[PDB]
Write a protein that binds this ligand. Sequence first.
Ligand SMILES: O[C@@H]1[C@@H](O)[C@H](O[C@@H]2CO[C@@H](O[C@@H]3CO[C@@H](O)[C@H](O)[C@H]3O)[C@H](O)[C@H]2O)OC[C@H]1O
Ligand SMILES: [Ca+2]
Length: 129
Amino acid sequence: GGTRSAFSNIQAEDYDSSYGPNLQIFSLPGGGSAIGYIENGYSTTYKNIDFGDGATSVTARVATQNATTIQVRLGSPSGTLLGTIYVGSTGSFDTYRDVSATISNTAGVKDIVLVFSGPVNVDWFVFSK
Ligand SMILES: O[C@@H]1[C@@H](O)[C@H](O[C@@H]2CO[C@@H](O[C@@H]3CO[C@@H](O)[C@H](O)[C@H]3O)[C@H](O)[C@H]2O)OC[C@H]1O
Ligand SMILES: [Ca+2]
């Protein structure tokens, strides 16, 4: 063990490494934190996520004023592209909605990377079989 499950919420602020000089962790009104001040080409890595025996869907709780994408990659921002979440505008960086995307079947313990194409605030993400 010593391993977050893919099937419970992974807090987006709980990255192990990241690229993006302007990236902030900040607190949410209802409790907890989220990541934000994201720009194109920023990424975060979440070490040792246990995808167990298969996940084929990702859900992210996100907020943004303009449609944007989050790529879900293996290992590094240059790794295998498992899928892309096409994030709709929610009207506000404070209005959060759960958004889902399919991914290639992913199993076992993996390092997961989210790669951003523009501004978005992210509370958590989770996978489903
Ligand atoms: O309540 C706070 C949120 O509103 C805050 O959202 C940030 C708002 O600023 C965003 O940056 C703008 C994106 O578009 C660019 O063209 C502008 O130059 C930027 O300033 C940023 O992406 C959001 O995260 O987040 C923190 C909350 O406390
Ligand atoms: Ca969070």
